[PDB]
Design a protein around this motif. Structure first.
Motif, mmCIF file in Angstrom:
data_model
loop_
_atom_site.group_PDB
_atom_site.id
_atom_site.type_symbol
_atom_site.label_atom_id
_atom_site.label_comp_id
_atom_site.label_asym_id
_atom_site.label_seq_id
_atom_site.Cartn_x
_atom_site.Cartn_y
_atom_site.Cartn_z
ATOM 1 N N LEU A 152 0.810 -1.231 0.000
ATOM 2 C CA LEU A 152 0.000 0.000 0.000
ATOM 3 C C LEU A 152 0.839 1.275 0.000
ATOM 4 O O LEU A 152 0.563 2.223 0.750
ATOM 5 N N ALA A 153 1.869 1.283 -0.845
ATOM 6 C CA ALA A 153 2.406 2.529 -1.377
ATOM 7 C C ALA A 153 1.320 3.065 -2.321
ATOM 8 O O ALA A 153 0.308 2.404 -2.547
ATOM 9 N N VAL A 154 1.532 4.243 -2.891
ATOM 10 C CA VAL A 154 0.444 4.941 -3.588
ATOM 11 C C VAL A 154 -0.053 4.178 -4.824
ATOM 12 O O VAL A 154 -1.225 4.263 -5.173
ATOM 13 N N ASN B 162 -3.932 3.312 -5.126
ATOM 14 C CA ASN B 162 -4.704 3.834 -6.250
ATOM 15 C C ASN B 162 -5.283 2.734 -7.146
ATOM 16 O O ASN B 162 -6.383 2.869 -7.660
ATOM 17 N N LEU B 163 -4.590 1.617 -7.275
ATOM 18 C CA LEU B 163 -5.150 0.491 -8.019
ATOM 19 C C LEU B 163 -6.284 -0.208 -7.248
ATOM 20 O O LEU B 163 -7.279 -0.572 -7.833
ATOM 21 N N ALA B 164 -6.143 -0.383 -5.943
ATOM 22 C CA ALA B 164 -7.237 -0.950 -5.151
ATOM 23 C C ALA B 164 -8.473 -0.054 -5.265
ATOM 24 O O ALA B 164 -9.597 -0.543 -5.435
ATOM 25 N N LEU B 165 -8.253 1.254 -5.163
ATOM 26 C CA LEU B 165 -9.317 2.247 -5.327
ATOM 27 C C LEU B 165 -9.967 2.142 -6.718
ATOM 28 O O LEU B 165 -11.194 2.241 -6.838
ATOM 29 N N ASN B 166 -9.146 1.993 -7.768
ATOM 30 C CA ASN B 166 -9.646 1.774 -9.140
ATOM 31 C C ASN B 166 -10.550 0.530 -9.178
ATOM 32 O O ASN B 166 -11.717 0.585 -9.531
ATOM 33 N N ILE B 167 -10.001 -0.592 -8.763
ATOM 34 C CA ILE B 167 -10.746 -1.831 -8.700
ATOM 35 C C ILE B 167 -12.097 -1.690 -7.972
ATOM 36 O O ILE B 167 -13.123 -2.208 -8.431
ATOM 37 N N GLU B 168 -12.114 -0.976 -6.851
ATOM 38 C CA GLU B 168 -13.346 -0.856 -6.076
ATOM 39 C C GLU B 168 -14.389 -0.081 -6.842
ATOM 40 O O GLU B 168 -15.572 -0.437 -6.837
ATOM 41 N N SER C 52 1.129 0.556 -15.997
ATOM 42 C CA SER C 52 1.682 1.844 -16.353
ATOM 43 C C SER C 52 0.672 2.986 -16.252
ATOM 44 O O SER C 52 -0.544 2.784 -16.348
ATOM 45 N N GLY C 53 1.206 4.192 -16.078
ATOM 46 C CA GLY C 53 0.415 5.424 -16.030
ATOM 47 C C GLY C 53 0.721 6.336 -14.869
ATOM 48 O O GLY C 53 0.124 7.413 -14.757
ATOM 49 N N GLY C 54 1.631 5.912 -13.989
ATOM 50 C CA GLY C 54 1.912 6.657 -12.765
ATOM 51 C C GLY C 54 0.737 6.538 -11.809
ATOM 52 O O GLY C 54 -0.158 5.703 -12.017
ATOM 53 N N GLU C 55 0.737 7.371 -10.764
ATOM 54 C CA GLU C 55 -0.316 7.343 -9.752
ATOM 55 C C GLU C 55 -1.672 7.658 -10.371
ATOM 56 O O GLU C 55 -2.664 7.004 -10.073
ATOM 57 N N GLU C 56 -1.710 8.656 -11.253
ATOM 58 C CA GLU C 56 -2.974 9.081 -11.864
ATOM 59 C C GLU C 56 -3.559 7.980 -12.754
ATOM 60 O O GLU C 56 -4.772 7.741 -12.752
ATOM 61 N N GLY D 179 -7.041 4.637 -14.810
ATOM 62 C CA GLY D 179 -6.959 3.851 -16.042
ATOM 63 C C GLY D 179 -5.529 3.619 -16.454
ATOM 64 O O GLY D 179 -4.966 4.412 -17.212
ATOM 65 N N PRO D 180 -4.915 2.542 -15.925
ATOM 66 C CA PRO D 180 -3.571 2.205 -16.352
ATOM 67 C C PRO D 180 -3.579 1.355 -17.610
ATOM 68 O O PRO D 180 -4.621 0.870 -18.034
ATOM 69 N N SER D 181 -2.409 1.183 -18.197
ATOM 70 C CA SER D 181 -2.198 0.118 -19.164
ATOM 71 C C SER D 181 -1.785 -1.096 -18.360
ATOM 72 O O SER D 181 -0.963 -0.980 -17.471
ATOM 73 N N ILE D 182 -2.379 -2.249 -18.642
ATOM 74 C CA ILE D 182 -2.082 -3.472 -17.899
ATOM 75 C C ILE D 182 -1.503 -4.498 -18.865
ATOM 76 O O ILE D 182 -2.111 -4.800 -19.918
ATOM 77 N N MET D 183 -0.324 -5.017 -18.516
ATOM 78 C CA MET D 183 0.487 -5.824 -19.426
ATOM 79 C C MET D 183 0.782 -7.183 -18.816
ATOM 80 O O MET D 183 1.884 -7.405 -18.317
ATOM 81 N N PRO D 184 -0.204 -8.101 -18.840
ATOM 82 C CA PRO D 184 -0.077 -9.336 -18.075
ATOM 83 C C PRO D 184 0.499 -10.514 -18.861
ATOM 84 O O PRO D 184 0.157 -10.732 -20.021
ATOM 85 N N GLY D 185 1.367 -11.272 -18.201
ATOM 86 C CA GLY D 185 1.894 -12.522 -18.741
ATOM 87 C C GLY D 185 1.803 -13.614 -17.692
ATOM 88 O O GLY D 185 1.799 -13.347 -16.499
ATOM 89 N N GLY D 186 1.719 -14.849 -18.163
ATOM 90 C CA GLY D 186 1.611 -16.007 -17.307
ATOM 91 C C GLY D 186 0.801 -17.073 -18.007
ATOM 92 O O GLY D 186 0.742 -17.106 -19.238
#
Ligand SMILES: O=C(O)[C@H](O)[C@@H](O)[C@H](O)[C@H](O)COP(=O)(O)O
Lengths: 470, 471
Positions: A12-14, A18-24, A129-133, A138-145
């Protein structure tokens, strides 16, 4: 019989807040955890009114999530990520999904993925990606697995990711560490873009004598054209800000020591590993190191002579256009290199990267976002196997037209003593790449001379060695 | 009775270890050799007839054959084979014995092995050896790092077999742990840069003046008689005299322009990135090899991408040749300044107290970069040991002030004619960045605070600040 939350977030750095907040905000219920209690306390203060709950052990955290558990990790890269995974392992169950959203070295993701895989736990290393804002909005999400693992988390990624014209800035990248790899290259390209912008700025400042007002007007005007992008937009905005006490522009008040995270060198380091030429991004990283050596530079300036330079008296409008063109071409060369690196990596690691799709997700959310990325997609639409962007008919037509301007900017900078490391390395790349016979014939001869390293011939197949010493 | 205790032993009998073995023996030391693959030992013994070299056929036998404290030179394949060998030695060695690894080893593996072995009371010296196969036979440059007490024991052997210049052996105690292998790496990096820079001078003369093999040879021969005097310029002049028997062309014109490199070539550049030191010239040189390796892409692109449509050269020929020469020398200065500032950064990071004058001194002979150039570096540090950058030295400052106009003319001509000069161009950029008190990194820092709240410092106040850029 506790009531089960949809997604868990540890760290829970920023960025993670901010991503948890986005998700919610996209209608998911969140449990959170942080090794340091005081961060969870502070997040729960900030987060009141939201469907977010706090947990104060890893037992509690895992036990509060619905199966298959979806755990987003946003802790410091390295040992702290690894230590959090070790904490999780005793309590996770077969089928659960751990998502590392940290800025993680792809080869760590490779190892974790295998280690968890043998336990029956899915691991997705994803770049965000996208920084805190961005993280918040709305970040770019780049998932692998694992593909099947991704399919379970895809609807959440698509929910929170940025959208460009109705299209989510996320896609399945590839297996194991492919997502964190693409995130790395994205961060490389970003350093590159900022350096080339700086060069354009420095040229205008010192060749044309431009002040903050005029610089803003130039960059604002550039952002309505083909250079339209987030970095050029924010650049044009930065030059409008006035420091609050001196009356000068803030940007002239700022110390010219470019910081950088320890992750900034990875793209260049892996390029060396793969055998791909990455001159522009690498010069940009070294440019940051050089700027950090401020004290050495101010001392140097007092003893090292520059050239004699009577004031510039070319056409002002032509020169501004030459810089603009130099910048676009140099940017094209940089991405041409970066996308070549990703191809090479895809071959090495068997990732089957889809380069148009990659360009598509850099289109929004991320820091390097720009209209330009549409033409890169268009390029891979037309030829998915394309070996270099310079060969695509749009980029080829642009570089053949704008090369005279880059040549002029490089020649002019040299004579006037303005450092343009990225632009010049971009021009040397363009001239090397298009040249069929480079001077490495001499280098090979040398290496066989002193080292018996052998050479090949232009006219016949084989491996050859000469007894050079008569 | 009594297996005749030998002074030093060598494990690994490829040409390098064999030649080091023969070098050592020719200096009046007795040598015991061993090699895992048996036929190499057998072959070497019939090559070493009448010399004080004995074969041994097990690590046990090898170790029992040596004077205490034992001195063991490893010349085996890097990586697992080297650790495999050390691991077999360990049970047989004693408090005080000395294992010397002479390969082109990554300095961090040496650091690990050094401490792994110190735990058992065994000393470890990681040492670079430069000069090639002929140089290992006749007189290499030797760059040992490790425990000082252990280096003092083997120093006499190193000093005997090393090249000498003006009575000084091209060997010194470089520093602790992996110090020696680090300096070897930087040697290697510098070499790549020098070759690239001379390749660029060649291409400039070839394309701008249309020079053939024969006149290139006269130019590089002329250059060797001045300040550029160096083994690489020398061999370059000789290379342009060679003729291919089949085709009758200059041999150099028949050789495929596809520059190989060992996986070691990249290390200096990777390390510079780790330390936060600018190393643009050597890194561009590594990338130029990678580029040349993409020959097939390049010939494809050459049919498709157009360069400038430029007129043939009509300037003064002698002037242009001297401009290239000067650009080449200033560029070289800039590369060395960068490489020496890396070692300084490294010395500080790993606490090694490196002596930069002694390092330049052991690069004067034996090694591939050997040039009278290195004397002027030696002199700069003998003048100022804590010199932060060689550009600030009286000698080098005078050159760059007088030669920068050649470099600029060369970079500007290269650009306008479409002749790539990645090394020389980046040299100029570095020079112009180093001497510039306010760089455009103020915008970069503004950008970082704007998008990721990374904070900045300011020119006027002495604090740490963050602006809310959206107000
Ligand atoms: O949004 C992202 O892609 C990254 O997570 C973000 O942090 C940025 O791109 C750089 O990593 C910042 O690093 P510097 O502050 O070192 O430039």
């Amino acid at each position: 019989h506790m009531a089960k939350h949809q997604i868990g977030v540890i760290g829970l750095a920023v960025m993670g807040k901010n991503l948890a907040l986005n998700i919610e905000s996209k209608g998911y219920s969140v449990a959170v955890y942080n090794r340091l209690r005081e961060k969870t306390d502070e997040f729960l203060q900030e987060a009141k009114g939201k469907n977010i709950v706090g947990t104060y052990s890893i037992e509690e955290f895992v036990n509060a999530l619905e199966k298959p558990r979806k755990i987003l990790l946003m802790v410091k890269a390295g040992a702290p990520t690894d230590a959090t995974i070790e904490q999780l392992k005793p309590h996770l169950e077969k089928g659960d999904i751990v998502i590392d959203g940290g800025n993680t070295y792809f080869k760590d993701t490779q190892r974790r993925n295998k280690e968890l895989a043998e336990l029956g736990i899915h691991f997705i290393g994803t770049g965000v990606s996208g920084g805190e804002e961005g993280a918040l909005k709305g970040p770019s999400i780049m998932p692998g697995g694992q593909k099947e693992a991704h399919e379970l988390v895809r609807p959440i990624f698509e929910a929170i990711a940025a959208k460009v014209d109705g299209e989510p800035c996320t896609t399945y990248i590839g297996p194991d560490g492919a997502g964190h790899y693409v995130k790395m290259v994205h961060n490389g390209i970003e350093y590159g873009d900022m350096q080339l912008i700086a060069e354009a700025y420095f040229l205008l400042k010192h060749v044309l004598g431009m002040d903050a007002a005029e610089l803003h007007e130039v960059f604002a005007d550039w952002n309505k054209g083909e250079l339209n992008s987030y970095l050029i937009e924010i650049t044009a905005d930065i030059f409008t800000k006035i420091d609050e006490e001196t009356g000068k522009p803030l940007v002239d008040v700022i110390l010219d020591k470019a910081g950088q995270k320890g992750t900034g060198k990875w793209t260049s380091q892996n390029a060396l590993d793969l055998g791909v030429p990455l001159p522009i991004i690498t010069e940009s990283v070294f440019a940051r190191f050089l700027s950090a050596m401020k004290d050495e530079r101010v001392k140097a300036s007092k003893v090292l002579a520059g050239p004699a330079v009577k004031p510039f008296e070319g056409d002002r409008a032509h020169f501004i256009e030459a810089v603009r063109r130099a910048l676009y071409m140099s940017k094209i060369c940089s991405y041409a290199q970066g996308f070549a690196q990703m191809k090479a990596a895809s071959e090495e690691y068997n990732w089957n990267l889809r380069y148009g799709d990659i360009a598509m997700i850099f289109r929004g959310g991320c820091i390097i976002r720009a209209q330009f990325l549409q033409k890169i997609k268009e390029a891979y639409d037309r030829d998915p196997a394309l070996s270099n962007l310079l060969l695509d008919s749009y980029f080829k037509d642009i570089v053949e037209r704008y090369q005279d301007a880059l040549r002029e900017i490089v020649a002019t900078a040299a004579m006037r003593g303005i450092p343009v490391p990225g632009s010049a390395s971009a021009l040397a790349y363009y001239d090397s790449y298009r040249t069929a016979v480079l001077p490495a014939n001499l280098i090979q001869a040398q290496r066989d001379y002193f080292g018996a390293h052998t050479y090949e011939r232009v006219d016949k197949e084989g491996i050859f060695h000469t007894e050079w010493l008569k």
